[PDB]
């Protein structure tokens, strides 16, 4: 996919 | 020219008024092309530019899923951030994220970005090396340690060097008639007497794209930085931008002043003066 | 912890009396993001004003564009009314075609 998987701060 | 793709995400808690709102907007240069809003009645990645509409169903539902998961991730982050700063559950707080990539005229990676701010203050950023982090304070050091343990930077680097650049190149090709077209400013100088002794010269730039522009006034060829009123570049609503710069000049001295305009869409820089 | 909005009120196209145009109110440089913006015609709130999707600058400050159709005349007065946590009362900026 084009959007980025984010990670919990 | 050079180009950028950037996502701008905002997550904001609102105790007593439901779960934190998450909104993500994607841009190529100064053109927004997608939005996702968890407050939309049916949250989904939605097109906001014509050249992205040609992407098929798989594009939309894959990105929608990423953004739905990102909504939950940002809520997790906000819960953790509140704890890191020993904050009450009564207050509203904001987490902002910027990530994406810049490429040159040849489509090669210039650099990647992945950074965060909490309540308007820089919190943590992926360094230009795409391997290490810069943490603003002891709270961000907790995030850094966690992300180091999980090898998060390696995932971000792979995204930024690969997926991000690949899609930016694709967007630039599909939207080449607009994204790769610089529209020059339409310019003019107006004159407004303020008293018997003084008048305002205002140099206008209208209808330009992209937003980056330099507008300056000189007096006898010297820059008038301190004496110039320069408004923030502002969107017209038709994709283009506007800006003006003004100087207060002594009556009769107008021809000593020149406005200088630099913009990507101009074959050559402009030098204007008041033309009564 | 807070940044007060900058406000500009202006038209999309050069103003010409009697010709339909768009009235813009651009609010920028503010934090946090909650903000209320009304466009006014002779002191009265214009209905169904639209706005851009929330975004921000690289200094993290938010910006929004509010806009609506309008037809400038010599007699009609337009303005933008803005409230934000940083403001004691709503701020009103009048539309001036020369700015």
mmCIF file of C-alpha atoms in Angstrom:
data_model
loop_
_atom_site.group_PDB
_atom_site.id
_atom_site.type_symbol
_atom_site.label_atom_id
_atom_site.label_comp_id
_atom_site.label_asym_id
_atom_site.label_seq_id
_atom_site.Cartn_x
_atom_site.Cartn_y
_atom_site.Cartn_z
ATOM 1 C CA UNK A 1 0.000 0.000 0.000
ATOM 2 C CA UNK A 2 0.990 3.642 -0.551
ATOM 3 C CA UNK A 3 0.314 4.939 2.983
ATOM 4 C CA UNK A 4 2.775 4.193 5.811
ATOM 5 C CA UNK A 5 2.167 1.778 8.684
ATOM 6 C CA UNK A 6 2.728 3.784 11.875
ATOM 7 C CA UNK A 7 4.209 2.626 15.191
ATOM 8 C CA UNK A 8 2.959 3.477 18.680
ATOM 9 C CA UNK A 9 5.091 6.094 20.458
ATOM 10 C CA UNK B 1 12.095 20.270 -10.774
ATOM 11 C CA UNK B 2 12.428 18.551 -7.411
ATOM 12 C CA UNK B 3 9.308 17.123 -5.784
ATOM 13 C CA UNK B 4 8.012 15.951 -2.442
ATOM 14 C CA UNK B 5 5.378 13.604 -1.099
ATOM 15 C CA UNK B 6 4.269 14.264 2.451
ATOM 16 C CA UNK B 7 1.583 12.976 4.767
ATOM 17 C CA UNK B 8 0.461 15.363 7.495
ATOM 18 C CA UNK B 9 -1.349 13.592 10.339
ATOM 19 C CA UNK B 10 -3.110 15.169 13.316
ATOM 20 C CA UNK B 11 -4.513 13.202 16.259
ATOM 21 C CA UNK B 12 -6.283 15.154 18.979
ATOM 22 C CA UNK B 13 -7.759 13.866 22.227
ATOM 23 C CA UNK B 14 -10.999 15.314 23.525
ATOM 24 C CA UNK B 15 -11.884 13.880 26.949
ATOM 25 C CA UNK B 16 -15.625 13.493 27.428
ATOM 26 C CA UNK B 17 -16.267 13.863 23.689
ATOM 27 C CA UNK B 18 -15.319 10.432 22.386
ATOM 28 C CA UNK B 19 -12.047 8.967 21.168
ATOM 29 C CA UNK B 20 -9.302 11.131 19.671
ATOM 30 C CA UNK B 21 -9.965 12.351 16.144
ATOM 31 C CA UNK B 22 -7.393 11.240 13.558
ATOM 32 C CA UNK B 23 -6.987 13.058 10.258
ATOM 33 C CA UNK B 24 -4.352 12.341 7.618
ATOM 34 C CA UNK B 25 -3.843 14.432 4.494
ATOM 35 C CA UNK B 26 -1.435 13.546 1.710
ATOM 36 C CA UNK B 27 0.315 16.029 -0.595
ATOM 37 C CA UNK B 28 2.537 16.027 -3.621
ATOM 38 C CA UNK B 29 4.290 19.406 -3.366
ATOM 39 C CA UNK B 30 1.483 21.933 -2.713
ATOM 40 C CA UNK B 31 -1.283 19.693 -4.078
ATOM 41 C CA UNK B 32 -3.402 17.665 -1.665
ATOM 42 C CA UNK B 33 -4.368 14.300 -3.162
ATOM 43 C CA UNK B 34 -5.903 12.234 -0.332
ATOM 44 C CA UNK B 35 -7.621 12.659 3.000
ATOM 45 C CA UNK B 36 -8.693 10.318 5.780
ATOM 46 C CA UNK B 37 -10.778 11.511 8.721
ATOM 47 C CA UNK B 38 -11.916 9.213 11.535
ATOM 48 C CA UNK B 39 -14.823 11.637 12.122
ATOM 49 C CA UNK B 40 -16.186 11.091 8.587
ATOM 50 C CA UNK B 41 -19.479 9.167 8.714
ATOM 51 C CA UNK B 42 -17.767 6.393 6.753
ATOM 52 C CA UNK B 43 -13.979 6.835 7.177
ATOM 53 C CA UNK B 44 -12.040 5.916 4.047
ATOM 54 C CA UNK B 45 -9.047 7.133 2.072
ATOM 55 C CA UNK B 46 -10.693 9.623 -0.289
ATOM 56 C CA UNK B 47 -9.343 11.234 -3.473
ATOM 57 C CA UNK B 48 -8.809 15.016 -3.380
ATOM 58 C CA UNK B 49 -7.120 15.397 -6.787
ATOM 59 C CA UNK B 50 -8.256 14.205 -10.251
ATOM 60 C CA UNK B 51 -5.038 12.330 -11.178
ATOM 61 C CA UNK B 52 -5.358 9.929 -8.236
ATOM 62 C CA UNK B 53 -8.932 8.962 -9.138
ATOM 63 C CA UNK B 54 -7.553 6.556 -11.747
ATOM 64 C CA UNK B 55 -6.117 4.331 -9.016
ATOM 65 C CA UNK B 56 -8.244 1.204 -8.694
ATOM 66 C CA UNK B 57 -10.282 -0.199 -5.774
ATOM 67 C CA UNK B 58 -7.239 -2.022 -4.349
ATOM 68 C CA UNK B 59 -5.426 1.299 -3.866
ATOM 69 C CA UNK B 60 -8.348 2.766 -1.931
ATOM 70 C CA UNK B 61 -9.167 -0.191 0.298
ATOM 71 C CA UNK B 62 -5.508 -1.006 1.085
ATOM 72 C CA UNK B 63 -4.846 2.608 2.104
ATOM 73 C CA UNK B 64 -8.135 2.803 3.977
ATOM 74 C CA UNK B 65 -7.053 -0.173 6.046
ATOM 75 C CA UNK B 66 -3.648 1.381 6.787
ATOM 76 C CA UNK B 67 -5.352 4.580 7.927
ATOM 77 C CA UNK B 68 -7.934 2.809 10.080
ATOM 78 C CA UNK B 69 -5.078 0.994 11.823
ATOM 79 C CA UNK B 70 -3.153 4.281 12.050
ATOM 80 C CA UNK B 71 -6.122 5.832 13.854
ATOM 81 C CA UNK B 72 -5.770 3.179 16.557
ATOM 82 C CA UNK B 73 -1.998 3.533 16.633
ATOM 83 C CA UNK B 74 -2.195 7.295 17.143
ATOM 84 C CA UNK B 75 -4.699 6.763 19.961
ATOM 85 C CA UNK B 76 -2.250 4.345 21.573
ATOM 86 C CA UNK B 77 0.466 6.973 21.135
ATOM 87 C CA UNK B 78 -1.646 9.668 22.768
ATOM 88 C CA UNK B 79 -2.341 7.399 25.775
ATOM 89 C CA UNK B 80 1.357 6.679 26.111
ATOM 90 C CA UNK B 81 2.365 10.337 25.711
ATOM 91 C CA UNK B 82 -0.059 11.417 28.458
ATOM 92 C CA UNK B 83 1.701 8.961 30.769
ATOM 93 C CA UNK B 84 5.226 9.998 29.748
ATOM 94 C CA UNK B 85 4.459 13.556 30.813
ATOM 95 C CA UNK B 86 2.442 12.627 33.911
ATOM 96 C CA UNK B 87 -0.570 14.442 32.496
ATOM 97 C CA UNK B 88 -4.164 14.408 33.694
ATOM 98 C CA UNK B 89 -6.853 12.577 31.738
ATOM 99 C CA UNK B 90 -8.840 15.837 31.815
ATOM 100 C CA UNK B 91 -6.891 17.720 29.155
ATOM 101 C CA UNK B 92 -6.839 17.640 25.351
ATOM 102 C CA UNK B 93 -3.521 16.953 23.629
ATOM 103 C CA UNK B 94 -2.320 16.865 20.052
ATOM 104 C CA UNK B 95 0.033 14.464 18.258
ATOM 105 C CA UNK B 96 1.223 15.494 14.802
ATOM 106 C CA UNK B 97 3.215 13.420 12.316
ATOM 107 C CA UNK B 98 4.970 14.322 9.060
ATOM 108 C CA UNK B 99 6.492 11.647 6.817
ATOM 109 C CA UNK B 100 7.451 11.127 3.209
ATOM 110 C CA UNK B 101 10.168 11.619 0.673
ATOM 111 C CA UNK B 102 11.817 14.208 -1.552
ATOM 112 C CA UNK B 103 13.120 13.384 -5.042
ATOM 113 C CA UNK B 104 15.148 15.272 -7.623
ATOM 114 C CA UNK B 105 14.314 16.012 -11.296
ATOM 115 C CA UNK B 106 15.579 12.528 -12.165
ATOM 116 C CA UNK B 107 13.316 10.852 -9.618
ATOM 117 C CA UNK B 108 16.197 9.834 -7.336
ATOM 118 C CA UNK B 109 15.755 10.025 -3.570
ATOM 119 C CA UNK B 110 17.044 13.244 -2.058
ATOM 120 C CA UNK B 111 15.994 12.341 1.479
ATOM 121 C CA UNK B 112 13.279 10.840 3.642
ATOM 122 C CA UNK B 113 11.315 12.230 6.584
ATOM 123 C CA UNK B 114 9.488 10.770 9.569
ATOM 124 C CA UNK B 115 8.903 13.045 12.521
ATOM 125 C CA UNK B 116 6.487 13.843 15.342
ATOM 126 C CA UNK B 117 5.380 16.724 17.560
ATOM 127 C CA UNK B 118 3.399 16.606 20.782
ATOM 128 C CA UNK B 119 1.368 19.675 21.752
ATOM 129 C CA UNK B 120 3.137 21.714 19.076
ATOM 130 C CA UNK B 121 6.663 20.844 20.161
ATOM 131 C CA UNK B 122 9.089 18.586 18.351
ATOM 132 C CA UNK B 123 9.156 15.185 20.016
ATOM 133 C CA UNK B 124 11.121 12.647 17.943
ATOM 134 C CA UNK B 125 12.481 12.527 14.392
ATOM 135 C CA UNK B 126 14.099 9.928 12.172
ATOM 136 C CA UNK B 127 17.518 11.247 11.275
ATOM 137 C CA UNK B 128 18.545 11.879 7.669
ATOM 138 C CA UNK B 129 20.496 8.604 7.773
ATOM 139 C CA UNK B 130 17.155 6.771 8.129
ATOM 140 C CA UNK B 131 18.752 4.596 10.822
ATOM 141 C CA UNK B 132 18.851 6.658 14.021
ATOM 142 C CA UNK B 133 16.519 8.861 16.080
ATOM 143 C CA UNK B 134 16.702 12.282 17.654
ATOM 144 C CA UNK B 135 14.653 12.552 20.861
ATOM 145 C CA UNK B 136 13.745 15.983 22.264
ATOM 146 C CA UNK B 137 13.498 15.018 25.956
ATOM 147 C CA UNK B 138 13.393 12.149 28.431
ATOM 148 C CA UNK B 139 9.863 11.193 27.368
ATOM 149 C CA UNK B 140 10.919 10.911 23.726
ATOM 150 C CA UNK B 141 13.872 8.807 24.905
ATOM 151 C CA UNK B 142 11.330 6.201 26.026
ATOM 152 C CA UNK B 143 9.868 6.131 22.497
ATOM 153 C CA UNK B 144 13.389 5.987 21.061
ATOM 154 C CA UNK B 145 14.342 2.997 23.227
ATOM 155 C CA UNK B 146 11.132 1.220 22.258
ATOM 156 C CA UNK B 147 11.619 1.899 18.563
ATOM 157 C CA UNK B 148 15.274 0.805 18.746
ATOM 158 C CA UNK B 149 14.257 -2.463 20.421
ATOM 159 C CA UNK B 150 11.640 -3.146 17.738
ATOM 160 C CA UNK B 151 13.921 -2.054 14.852
ATOM 161 C CA UNK B 152 11.320 0.464 13.695
ATOM 162 C CA UNK B 153 13.836 2.614 11.788
ATOM 163 C CA UNK B 154 14.550 -0.302 9.422
ATOM 164 C CA UNK B 155 10.848 -0.510 8.510
ATOM 165 C CA UNK B 156 10.590 3.241 8.028
ATOM 166 C CA UNK B 157 13.738 3.287 5.876
ATOM 167 C CA UNK B 158 12.398 0.521 3.640
ATOM 168 C CA UNK B 159 9.149 2.452 3.217
ATOM 169 C CA UNK B 160 10.813 5.790 2.564
ATOM 170 C CA UNK B 161 13.434 4.527 0.089
ATOM 171 C CA UNK B 162 11.086 2.156 -1.701
ATOM 172 C CA UNK B 163 7.305 2.544 -1.528
ATOM 173 C CA UNK B 164 7.302 6.326 -1.005
ATOM 174 C CA UNK B 165 9.652 7.063 -3.891
ATOM 175 C CA UNK B 166 7.911 4.548 -6.181
ATOM 176 C CA UNK B 167 4.498 6.099 -5.594
ATOM 177 C CA UNK B 168 5.757 9.669 -5.851
ATOM 178 C CA UNK B 169 7.233 8.827 -9.260
ATOM 179 C CA UNK B 170 3.917 7.271 -10.266
ATOM 180 C CA UNK B 171 1.893 10.279 -9.092
ATOM 181 C CA UNK B 172 4.195 12.660 -10.949
ATOM 182 C CA UNK B 173 3.692 10.703 -14.183
ATOM 183 C CA UNK B 174 -0.081 10.462 -13.815
ATOM 184 C CA UNK B 175 -0.456 14.125 -12.880
ATOM 185 C CA UNK B 176 2.298 15.504 -15.119
ATOM 186 C CA UNK B 177 0.060 18.155 -16.723
ATOM 187 C CA UNK B 178 -0.412 19.841 -13.311
ATOM 188 C CA UNK B 179 2.206 18.573 -10.840
ATOM 189 C CA UNK B 180 5.060 19.312 -13.252
ATOM 190 C CA UNK B 181 3.664 22.630 -14.407
ATOM 191 C CA UNK B 182 4.877 25.770 -12.675
ATOM 192 C CA UNK B 183 2.450 28.655 -13.148
ATOM 193 C CA UNK B 184 4.215 32.018 -12.907
ATOM 194 C CA UNK B 185 2.913 34.916 -10.809
ATOM 195 C CA UNK B 186 0.819 37.643 -12.416
ATOM 196 C CA UNK B 187 2.306 40.817 -10.976
ATOM 197 C CA UNK B 188 1.468 44.475 -10.466
ATOM 198 C CA UNK B 189 2.343 47.364 -8.181
ATOM 199 C CA UNK B 190 -0.321 49.476 -6.520
ATOM 200 C CA UNK B 191 0.066 52.872 -4.868
ATOM 201 C CA UNK B 192 -1.883 54.100 -1.834
ATOM 202 C CA UNK B 193 -1.217 57.578 -0.388
ATOM 203 C CA UNK B 194 -1.350 57.504 3.434
ATOM 204 C CA UNK B 195 -0.706 61.209 4.042
ATOM 205 C CA UNK B 196 0.762 64.256 2.324
ATOM 206 C CA UNK B 197 4.227 62.915 3.173
ATOM 207 C CA UNK B 198 4.069 59.175 2.480
ATOM 208 C CA UNK B 199 2.449 56.485 0.340
ATOM 209 C CA UNK B 200 2.324 52.684 0.324
ATOM 210 C CA UNK B 201 3.711 50.748 -2.631
ATOM 211 C CA UNK B 202 2.352 47.205 -2.688
ATOM 212 C CA UNK B 203 3.847 44.548 -4.950
ATOM 213 C CA UNK B 204 1.394 41.755 -5.847
ATOM 214 C CA UNK B 205 1.946 38.193 -6.994
ATOM 215 C CA UNK B 206 -1.186 36.277 -8.016
ATOM 216 C CA UNK B 207 -2.030 32.912 -9.529
ATOM 217 C CA UNK B 208 1.291 31.144 -9.025
ATOM 218 C CA UNK B 209 2.128 27.478 -8.378
ATOM 219 C CA UNK B 210 3.957 26.068 -6.479
ATOM 220 C CA UNK B 211 3.739 28.255 -3.392
ATOM 221 C CA UNK B 212 7.466 28.945 -3.041
ATOM 222 C CA UNK B 213 8.178 32.531 -4.134
ATOM 223 C CA UNK B 214 10.513 35.399 -3.282
ATOM 224 C CA UNK B 215 9.049 38.923 -3.209
ATOM 225 C CA UNK B 216 11.338 41.767 -2.139
ATOM 226 C CA UNK B 217 11.486 45.552 -2.280
ATOM 227 C CA UNK B 218 14.707 47.449 -2.873
ATOM 228 C CA UNK B 219 15.407 51.160 -2.407
ATOM 229 C CA UNK B 220 18.288 52.357 -4.627
ATOM 230 C CA UNK B 221 19.154 48.675 -5.060
ATOM 231 C CA UNK B 222 19.335 47.896 -1.323
ATOM 232 C CA UNK B 223 17.024 45.272 0.196
ATOM 233 C CA UNK B 224 14.417 46.762 2.528
ATOM 234 C CA UNK B 225 13.911 43.685 4.720
ATOM 235 C CA UNK B 226 13.163 45.537 7.961
ATOM 236 C CA UNK B 227 10.835 48.071 6.329
ATOM 237 C CA UNK B 228 8.834 45.645 4.171
ATOM 238 C CA UNK B 229 5.474 44.235 5.258
ATOM 239 C CA UNK B 230 5.344 40.719 3.824
ATOM 240 C CA UNK B 231 2.118 38.716 4.190
ATOM 241 C CA UNK B 232 2.128 34.941 4.405
ATOM 242 C CA UNK B 233 1.686 33.165 1.084
ATOM 243 C CA UNK B 234 -2.009 32.284 0.857
ATOM 244 C CA UNK B 235 -4.103 29.848 -1.207
ATOM 245 C CA UNK B 236 -6.559 31.195 -3.781
ATOM 246 C CA UNK B 237 -8.672 28.021 -3.852
ATOM 247 C CA UNK B 238 -8.009 27.234 -7.539
ATOM 248 C CA UNK B 239 -4.655 25.476 -6.754
ATOM 249 C CA UNK B 240 -2.689 28.713 -7.023
ATOM 250 C CA UNK B 241 -1.254 31.029 -4.377
ATOM 251 C CA UNK B 242 -1.030 34.759 -3.719
ATOM 252 C CA UNK B 243 1.386 37.025 -1.856
ATOM 253 C CA UNK B 244 2.153 40.716 -1.482
ATOM 254 C CA UNK B 245 4.926 42.896 -0.078
ATOM 255 C CA UNK B 246 4.516 46.548 0.859
ATOM 256 C CA UNK B 247 6.779 49.484 1.697
ATOM 257 C CA UNK B 248 5.980 52.960 2.955
ATOM 258 C CA UNK B 249 7.807 55.493 0.819
ATOM 259 C CA UNK B 250 8.282 59.265 0.928
ATOM 260 C CA UNK B 251 6.069 61.142 -1.549
ATOM 261 C CA UNK B 252 7.964 61.753 -4.782
ATOM 262 C CA UNK B 253 10.519 59.000 -4.192
ATOM 263 C CA UNK B 254 8.511 56.128 -5.743
ATOM 264 C CA UNK B 255 10.866 55.499 -8.681
ATOM 265 C CA UNK B 256 13.723 54.716 -6.300
ATOM 266 C CA UNK B 257 11.869 51.550 -5.311
ATOM 267 C CA UNK B 258 11.875 48.253 -7.193
ATOM 268 C CA UNK B 259 9.974 45.053 -6.518
ATOM 269 C CA UNK B 260 11.803 41.823 -7.315
ATOM 270 C CA UNK B 261 10.025 38.537 -7.997
ATOM 271 C CA UNK B 262 11.585 35.081 -8.211
ATOM 272 C CA UNK B 263 9.499 32.019 -9.080
ATOM 273 C CA UNK B 264 9.967 28.676 -10.850
ATOM 274 C CA UNK B 265 7.318 29.529 -13.471
ATOM 275 C CA UNK B 266 9.071 32.692 -14.647
ATOM 276 C CA UNK B 267 11.431 32.504 -17.633
ATOM 277 C CA UNK B 268 13.409 35.248 -15.870
ATOM 278 C CA UNK B 269 13.088 37.110 -12.545
ATOM 279 C CA UNK B 270 10.985 40.277 -12.603
ATOM 280 C CA UNK B 271 11.861 43.825 -11.606
ATOM 281 C CA UNK B 272 8.758 46.005 -11.267
ATOM 282 C CA UNK B 273 8.178 49.585 -10.276
ATOM 283 C CA UNK B 274 5.123 51.776 -9.771
ATOM 284 C CA UNK B 275 3.763 52.683 -13.198
ATOM 285 C CA UNK B 276 1.518 55.735 -12.810
ATOM 286 C CA UNK C 1 2.055 26.075 24.351
ATOM 287 C CA UNK C 2 -0.338 28.153 22.240
ATOM 288 C CA UNK C 3 -0.050 30.117 19.010
ATOM 289 C CA UNK C 4 -2.607 32.704 17.956
ATOM 290 C CA UNK C 5 -3.921 32.608 14.369
ATOM 291 C CA UNK C 6 -2.894 34.950 11.594
ATOM 292 C CA UNK C 7 -5.935 35.962 9.531
ATOM 293 C CA UNK C 8 -6.224 37.104 5.920
ATOM 294 C CA UNK C 9 -9.469 37.891 4.088
ATOM 295 C CA UNK C 10 -9.313 38.197 0.313
ATOM 296 C CA UNK C 11 -10.831 37.141 -2.982
ATOM 297 C CA UNK C 12 -9.875 34.259 -5.274
ATOM 298 C CA UNK C 13 -9.986 36.439 -8.390
ATOM 299 C CA UNK C 14 -9.361 40.198 -8.655
ATOM 300 C CA UNK C 15 -12.497 41.910 -7.334
ATOM 301 C CA UNK C 16 -14.909 43.457 -9.830
ATOM 302 C CA UNK C 17 -18.210 44.897 -8.628
ATOM 303 C CA UNK C 18 -21.187 42.817 -9.698
ATOM 304 C CA UNK C 19 -19.137 39.820 -10.836
ATOM 305 C CA UNK C 20 -19.288 36.502 -8.957
ATOM 306 C CA UNK C 21 -16.080 35.513 -7.164
ATOM 307 C CA UNK C 22 -14.956 33.616 -4.068
ATOM 308 C CA UNK C 23 -14.407 35.133 -0.632
ATOM 309 C CA UNK C 24 -11.571 33.529 1.312
ATOM 310 C CA UNK C 25 -10.608 33.645 4.949
ATOM 311 C CA UNK C 26 -7.242 31.993 5.518
ATOM 312 C CA UNK C 27 -6.286 31.268 9.116
ATOM 313 C CA UNK C 28 -2.761 30.065 9.772
ATOM 314 C CA UNK C 29 0.029 29.791 12.308
ATOM 315 C CA UNK C 30 -2.205 28.604 15.147
ATOM 316 C CA UNK C 31 -2.004 25.930 17.850
ATOM 317 C CA UNK C 32 -3.975 24.033 19.030
ATOM 318 C CA UNK C 33 -6.165 23.198 16.045
ATOM 319 C CA UNK C 34 -9.641 23.978 17.361
ATOM 320 C CA UNK C 35 -10.843 27.196 15.751
ATOM 321 C CA UNK C 36 -14.144 28.763 14.735
ATOM 322 C CA UNK C 37 -14.374 30.826 11.571
ATOM 323 C CA UNK C 38 -17.398 32.641 10.151
ATOM 324 C CA UNK C 39 -17.635 34.667 6.969
ATOM 325 C CA UNK C 40 -19.886 37.717 7.323
ATOM 326 C CA UNK C 41 -21.903 39.729 4.823
ATOM 327 C CA UNK C 42 -22.958 43.084 6.265
ATOM 328 C CA UNK C 43 -22.432 41.704 9.775
ATOM 329 C CA UNK C 44 -24.447 38.515 9.187
ATOM 330 C CA UNK C 45 -23.084 34.954 9.121
ATOM 331 C CA UNK C 46 -22.963 33.433 5.627
ATOM 332 C CA UNK C 47 -24.440 29.900 5.518
ATOM 333 C CA UNK C 48 -22.765 26.764 4.114
ATOM 334 C CA UNK C 49 -19.246 28.205 4.026
ATOM 335 C CA UNK C 50 -16.836 25.396 3.172
ATOM 336 C CA UNK C 51 -13.313 24.795 4.363
ATOM 337 C CA UNK C 52 -10.128 22.917 3.523
ATOM 338 C CA UNK C 53 -8.945 19.745 5.271
ATOM 339 C CA UNK C 54 -6.929 20.369 8.440
ATOM 340 C CA UNK C 55 -3.224 20.473 7.686
ATOM 341 C CA UNK C 56 -0.161 22.195 9.068
ATOM 342 C CA UNK C 57 3.143 23.829 8.159
ATOM 343 C CA UNK C 58 6.568 22.371 8.848
ATOM 344 C CA UNK C 59 6.711 24.406 12.079
ATOM 345 C CA UNK C 60 3.643 22.349 13.119
ATOM 346 C CA UNK C 61 1.274 25.333 13.104
ATOM 347 C CA UNK C 62 -2.193 24.660 11.654
ATOM 348 C CA UNK C 63 -3.892 26.326 8.711
ATOM 349 C CA UNK C 64 -7.374 26.289 7.189
ATOM 350 C CA UNK C 65 -9.009 28.077 4.289
ATOM 351 C CA UNK C 66 -12.699 29.000 4.602
ATOM 352 C CA UNK C 67 -14.422 30.057 1.413
ATOM 353 C CA UNK C 68 -17.785 30.841 -0.157
ATOM 354 C CA UNK C 69 -19.245 32.311 -3.343
ATOM 355 C CA UNK C 70 -19.756 36.071 -3.230
ATOM 356 C CA UNK C 71 -20.506 38.972 -5.536
ATOM 357 C CA UNK C 72 -18.613 42.128 -4.521
ATOM 358 C CA UNK C 73 -20.429 45.458 -4.795
ATOM 359 C CA UNK C 74 -19.597 48.986 -3.720
ATOM 360 C CA UNK C 75 -22.047 48.892 -0.812
ATOM 361 C CA UNK C 76 -21.764 45.356 0.598
ATOM 362 C CA UNK C 77 -19.245 44.767 3.375
ATOM 363 C CA UNK C 78 -17.581 41.411 3.961
ATOM 364 C CA UNK C 79 -15.560 40.160 6.909
ATOM 365 C CA UNK C 80 -14.151 37.103 8.648
ATOM 366 C CA UNK C 81 -14.804 36.408 12.334
ATOM 367 C CA UNK C 82 -12.350 34.141 14.145
ATOM 368 C CA UNK C 83 -12.277 32.694 17.645
ATOM 369 C CA UNK C 84 -9.499 30.599 19.157
ATOM 370 C CA UNK C 85 -8.415 29.708 22.695
ATOM 371 C CA UNK C 86 -5.714 32.417 22.431
ATOM 372 C CA UNK C 87 -8.339 35.129 21.840
ATOM 373 C CA UNK C 88 -10.356 36.828 24.600
ATOM 374 C CA UNK C 89 -13.102 37.691 22.108
ATOM 375 C CA UNK C 90 -13.708 36.873 18.447
ATOM 376 C CA UNK C 91 -11.463 38.830 16.100
ATOM 377 C CA UNK C 92 -13.055 40.451 13.047
ATOM 378 C CA UNK C 93 -11.005 41.236 9.946
ATOM 379 C CA UNK C 94 -12.756 43.204 7.211
ATOM 380 C CA UNK C 95 -12.375 42.422 3.512
ATOM 381 C CA UNK C 96 -10.345 45.157 1.811
ATOM 382 C CA UNK C 97 -9.793 44.584 -1.929
ATOM 383 C CA UNK C 98 -6.402 46.270 -1.686
ATOM 384 C CA UNK C 99 -5.037 43.631 0.727
#
